[PDB]
Amino acid sequence: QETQGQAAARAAAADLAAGQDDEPRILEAPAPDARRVYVNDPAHFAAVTQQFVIDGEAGRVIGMIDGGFLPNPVVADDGSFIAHASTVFSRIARGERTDYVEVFDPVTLLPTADIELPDAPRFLVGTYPWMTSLTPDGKTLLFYQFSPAPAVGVVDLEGKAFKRMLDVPDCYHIFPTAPDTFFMHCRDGSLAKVAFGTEGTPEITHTEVFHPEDEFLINHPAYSQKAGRLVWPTYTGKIHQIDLSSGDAKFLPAVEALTEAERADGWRPGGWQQVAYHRALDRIYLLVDQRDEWRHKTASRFVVVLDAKTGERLAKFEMGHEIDSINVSQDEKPLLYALSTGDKTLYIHDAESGEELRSVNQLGHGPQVITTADMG
């Protein structure tokens, strides 16, 4: 029952009693681990923003990173570094725009690379984790550009330089599969495979169209790079699963997050990061609630858990709060992270029972995105 602030008072009181000296210094964050979790605050389109580095076990903020306008956070699955694509202006929200990638050391939180992106090429949009993406080898960062056209930026983190813009068709999101390959989702209902050598056009292949014009796929699919699993819920909780672990897109069976009855009863997914995917347990987590068809971005009070292989429901948690985004740690007995944009609190649940263990409040103005590293 002793809180961290209380234990802290006791230790400080004891150091004073014992006459213990200690040097006021810059603390190092604890080595990244499986329970480390990052919460990004897009601050409702504020010109500057914050990333909160959280120890998920202690429910303690272990550091912070400042960002610009709608930055895209990335987190190297192996823990070696974090990075983001950010955007600043010479006069708060006006004047000369600089888009840039920063790479950070994960314990000092110090920037180790700062890479300018030429011609302000970032897609500025409410934050979608897969609009900016690390290749599996951590050597390359890929960001989406929408204007003047769909395009994908290649950033060399190893050489600390921007390389070039790739042409793509009318497609969206970026899911890296190899040092030189990523898939996108296209308007025509297909996925585009993009392979890029070092020069000239990329080689763009399309898959078969895998959903119709009237079946709407969410802006926040779950993608496990180490699995190659793309998990894509529709507005109705229909979930498209696309395997990418052979290099090409195999389409897994389509599965339903909600029952026929529940959908008739008005149950729909809703929120921001509406879907989480645990890699080892091959499991899907989906933020759902009873809502109108066009209330798809509102908070949800329930998480449903289903086996990705079968589609069977494994549990349904009443979260006890207005949740907008979820994610999971990728260790055994994982935590289920439930972020409330409204509360500005990360509620940290046991992913097995759905029980609330601890929470971390005051996480900015309108936090939305949870990222974890898949360190296993």
């Binding site: 204007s147 003047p148 056209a149 769909p150 042409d167 068709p169 009318d170 308007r187 025509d188 014009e213």
Partner: protein, 354 residues
């Protein structure tokens, strides 16, 4: 009265006796069978039309008369933007002021003067009766009254529901009578979300009672010269079409190179496009807007020539704020836009689409 006046206009419109050699009428160039445009192949293809003398070519594409009666009289509005009038350069105030100009233009109908016009009206017993019933006795004996009366009859004829039937698929969809195809609705959406609607819409906001897909303003979209048309016109390789600045009374250099936003009604069946008929295909006219937005190497290239569009005939006063929308139209959106535009074809010209 307005009935009779229009009926007299209907007669005058198809009467080649209003040309010097009696070989052409309004209808020769504004052919009712081609949405009131010229089907006749000439030195420069369908880009420009051939006058009464059988050789003289104009320097501008012959525009449709459909919906032209919806354009306001020429005026400068409160934002200091010119709006309305007739001709590509707005040099005529209204349909009435315009009517007389082709009759006396030596490269077109080529009557020497109003007197000669009145003389040909006097030859026709049906004109003596028709005119005199509407304008009074001896109207045809006075060249000024006759010419004015003819122009007025022509203007009234052009304001009949026959020129502006509002019976396009678009019209019927907005009446709830039918629906757009998926592609058409996408075209419509694209048209109002991308830069198009900043110029090809009657209003900035609200609902237009009789939409004709033009705000009646003048813009320089930076088009190049049409080589063959320009050659055919005989105005010279030195010549620069200064658009609106050519209207007498307009002195403002910011208006040089600006042309009236054409109504996009029946656009699908009135190729070739722009003030000089430089693009044969509608798809090309759409594509041309990408040169201001797309950074792809193909945006700089006219698909009809496989070569750079060409420098603006007038490099300045480009509507860059509107044109540089920082958004490219991909193939899909150009397809959508073509579909949408085809729905602006009048019922009677729907057979002409193929």
């Amino acid at each position: 009265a307005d009935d009779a006046l229009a009926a007299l206009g209907a007669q005058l419109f198809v009467d080649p006796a209003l040309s010097r050699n009696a070989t052409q009428s309004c209808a020769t160039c504004h052919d009712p069978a081609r949405a009131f445009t010229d089907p006749r192949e000439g030195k420069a293809g369908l880009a420009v039309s051939v006058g009464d003398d059988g050789q003289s070519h104009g320097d501008r594409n012959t525009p449709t008369l459909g919906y032209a009666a919806l354009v306001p009289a020429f005026h400068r509005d409160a934002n200091g933007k010119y709006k309305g009038g007739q001709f590509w350069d707005g040099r005529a105030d209204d349909l009435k002021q315009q009517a007389g100009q082709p009759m006396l233009n030596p490269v077109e109908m080529a009557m020497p003067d109003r007197a000669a016009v009145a003389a040909r009206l006097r030859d026709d017993p049906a004109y003596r009766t028709g005119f005199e019933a509407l304008f009074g006795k001896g109207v045809l004996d006075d060249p000024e009254r006759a010419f004015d009366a003819a122009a007025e009859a022509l203007a009234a004829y052009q304001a009949t529901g026959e020129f502006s039937p509002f019976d396009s698929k678009y019209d019927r969809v907005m009446r709830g009578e039918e629906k757009f195809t998926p592609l058409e609705e996408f075209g419509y959406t694209v048209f109002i979300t991308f830069n198009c609607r900043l110029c090809h819409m009657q209003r900035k906001q609200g609902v237009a009672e009789r939409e004709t897909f033009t705000n009646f303003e003048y813009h320089n979209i930076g088009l190049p010269v049409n080589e063959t048309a320009r050659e055919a016109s005989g105005l010279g390789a030195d010549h620069v079409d200064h658009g609106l600045l050519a209207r007498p009374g307009i002195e403002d250099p910011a208006q040089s190179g600006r042309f009236k936003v054409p109504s996009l009604r029946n656009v699908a069946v009135t190729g070739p496009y722009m003030h000089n008929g430089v693009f044969t295909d509608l798809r090309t006219a759409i594509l041309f807007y990408n040169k201001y937005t797309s950074r792809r190497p193909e945006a700089k290239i006219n698909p009809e020539t496989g070569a750079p569009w060409g420098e603006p005939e007038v490099a300045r006063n480009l509507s860059l704020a509107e044109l540089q929308s920082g958004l490219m139209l991909d193939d899909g959106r150009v397809d959508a836009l073509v579909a949408f535009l085809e729905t602006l074809t009048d019922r009677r010209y729907e057979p002409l689409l193929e």
